[PDB]
Structures are given as C-alpha cells and as structure tokens.
C-alpha cells in the first residue's frame, strides 16, 4: 500500500449536484462518477470530493459510509464527512477491468454571511477536474410549534425542538404539551435540556435537567415514559407567562432503512386576548439521509 494515490484528476468523469438552487439549511444531492479510461484503478487509490467549509457559504456532508461492491465482494468504500467525501479502493479492485462507478450522497447548504450578492451565495463543489455550483439563498412566530433536524456530523440521532410561548406572552391557563415519538427511533433521556428565556432566564442541561427545572418551577412536570416514547409537559400559568420554553432532545435511530422519522404533539393553551387552544396538533417529520454507491467491473 504505502501512501494513498489521489486519482481524482485522472479518473473522475462527471460531478453533478441536484437541485442547484436551495434555501438556507436546505438539502441537495451530490453525484460523482468515475471510470478507468485514463488510468487503471489500483489498491490505495482515493477520489476526493471537496467543498467550501467556511466563508460566505458552507457545505456540510451528512456522515455516511457506503461500500462499493462487485458480485458480493467489497472493492471500495465511500466515506462522507461534514468537510469532505473520500472514495478509497482496496486490493480487490485490481482484479477488475473496465471499471466504472458512482458516488451519490446528500449535503447541507448554509449561507453564513446572509447575503444576496450573487457570487457570494454560490458554493463550488469540486472533484478532480470537474466542478459544479450550488446556489444557497439567505434566511413573527406562533405560540407553540415543533421542529427537528439531523446533524451532518451525527446521522444516528434525530434532534427535536419543542418551542413553547415564543413571543413571551401572558397566559391565562396552564400550558399542557403531550408529545408522542413514533416508531423507528428511541428517546435518549440524557440529551433532554430545557432553555428558558424571559423573566426566569435559565438553561437546564445534563442528567439533572428535569429535576432542576421542576425545583425552580414548582408545579411544573416533565413526565417521560422511555418505553412508550412519550413526553408530557405541564407548565403553570404563573411561570408560563412572560417566558419562552425551548425543549430539545435527541432520538437514537433504531431503524436504519426508515425514510421518515415522525414526532407528534398536542397543545393546550390560551393567550389572554386570544382564543383557547384545546388539543391542536403540531407535528413534524424529519427525512432520513440518502447515500448510495455503485461500481461495475469485469473479472476476466
């Protein structure tokens, strides 16, 4: 083996990113194709896919590891990281002739400077001699809404956010949130944490996150059933008023092949001056990351 040979400039034939126009924090798919027309692929050879990691635009590759297989035999590996993508070939690729393949993976585009100056919002993804462009457009809230995403550095977990009383308005009754986490994922209790902003501004994190919250706010109860994957939040009207409650938590993925991860929640609240909300649905769905890699060759 020895040192890894960068064969991106010689072997890469096409690099395409679709869609070419995305919003801030949007997802887009990158495809890289290669063949051994210009040079025979050897053991230890690597193909690199590079993109901007800092500046005006940021591209973050969702962490995935996809094997390159010919007739059940693994001949290569596709490793995607938040800062780069690498295609590494082993000794089993040397027995193959007329070799051709591809690497398809999803990335996240970010507009860091938040700009509309055309050239700054364009992210250039490169692989050898091939280059392609991605346009990343730059970025009042309701009382309660629920959202979530998957981190580019960690694909095994799905983040969830329970944003309660976002405008810090006075409330006439006790705020009740009944959350239900659907199948294909398991709640990690240690990754809870609650962020409170307003009159009672404090951040509660760690193992004692629930205990410290219930002590600082008497009457409050974050009931967690780990087996049933349900979180029941009760906040008294005295502490619910003039305060914003952001409840985060991570869910470990048990079903790898599952395409959608769903979280459901019902809300009971009434802003003083507004109509009473009685069990209105506030649901969110997070899509799983798609990554595929194929390779063809003749054993001869």
Swiss-Prot record:
Cross-link (Isoaspartyl lysine isopeptide (Lys-Asn)): 146-263
Compartments where located: Secreted, Cell wall
Coiled-coil zones: none
Spans annotated as Collagen-binding: 125-288
Record site: Autocatalyzes isopeptide 176-293 formation: 179
Subunit-structure text: Interacts (via N-terminus) with type I collagen. Interacts with host C1QA.
This protein's domain notes: Composed of a N-terminal A-region and a number of B-repeats depending on the strain. At the C-terminal end are features required for surface targeting and covalently anchoring to the peptidoglycan. The collagen binding activity is located in the A-region.
Function statement: Collagen-binding adhesin that mediates bacterial adherence to collagenous tissues such as cartilage. Participates in the infectious process by acting as a virulence factor in many different animal models of staphylococcal infections including arthritis, endocarditis and keratitis. Inhibits the activation of the classical complement pathway by interacting with host C1q and interfering with the association between host C1r with C1q.
Name this protein carries in UniProt: Collagen adhesin
Organism encoding this protein: Staphylococcus aureus
Lineage, uppermost ranks: Bacteria, Bacillati, Bacillota, Bacilli, Bacillales
Location of this fragment in the whole protein: 30 to 330 of 1183
